[PDB]
């Protein structure tokens, strides 16, 4: 039945019906056993699509809002703000759903270094997504929760995974975005990304046959951000 859910999740993924893909993978998480690499990946892809659609909508509506602040059309701005708020409600609901799954099911049952890093990093990501649109105390709390999770993932990654491991590199990449975009700290973002890239370069003998393309891609993205940030 676990095998059946995974199949259903793969069919939903092919059909691009990511809500159903989330439904199926959340049931697998609901089983309180260590997920396979395949299952972790399917769950992560499902929520990143579901949340990504709303993050993309939110950025569009926000940019429309900013244009109109310059034209000062107030009837328009009332409708744009109400629309944005509706999308923020969905963003909050989706983040809260996977954060619950992580706290109740995935993290407690994770028993490998790789899975622990993967799930704390996911925790880091979803609080960071809450922080993207939050203001005032909600933003401070999301930022503090994101930081705690990313630090937890980093402690484990530093002791358990080689510096070329794609989950470790993916962690460095996203934690560096966190410092840049949420904490407004280009200096710390640059340091973290540069250190992760250099530490990988120092140990390229650790690249795995299973994941060298994935490692190579994240390292290119670390470099691409360093470019963007300098």
């Amino acid at each position: 039945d676990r095998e059946d859910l995974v199949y259903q999740a793969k069919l939903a993924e092919q059909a691009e019906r990511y809500d159903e893909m989330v439904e199926s993978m959340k049931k697998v998480a609901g089983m309180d056993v260590e997920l396979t690499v395949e299952e972790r990946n399917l769950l992560s892809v499902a929520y990143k699509n579901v949340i990504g659609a709303r993050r993309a909508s939110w950025r569009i509506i926000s940019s429309i809002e900013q244009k109109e602040e310059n034209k000062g059309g107030e009837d328009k701005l009332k409708m744009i703000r109400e629309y944005r708020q509706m999308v923020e409600t969905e963003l909050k609901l989706i983040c809260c759903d996977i954060l619950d799954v992580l706290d109740k099911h995935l993290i407690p049952a994770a028993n490998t270094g790789e899975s622990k890093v993967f799930y704390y990093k996911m925790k880091g990501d979803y609080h960071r997504y809450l922080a993207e649109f939050a203001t005032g105390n909600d933003r401070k709390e999301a930022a503090e929760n994101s930081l705690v999770a990313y630090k937890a993932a980093s402690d484990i990654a530093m002791t358990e995974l080689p510096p070329t491991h794609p989950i470790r590199l993916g962690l460095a990449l996203n934690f560096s975005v966190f410092y840049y975009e949420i904490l407004n700290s280009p200096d710390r973002a640059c340091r973290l990304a540069k250190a992760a890239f250099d530490d990988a370069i120092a140990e390229l003998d650790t690249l795995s046959e299973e994941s060298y393309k994935d490692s190579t891609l994240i390292m290119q993205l670390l470099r691409d951000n360093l470019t963007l940030w300098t």
Partner: peptide
């Protein structure tokens, strides 16, 4: 506008 970890 920064790049975070991709999916697919």
């Amino acid at each position: 506008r920064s790049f975070s970890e991709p999916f697919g």
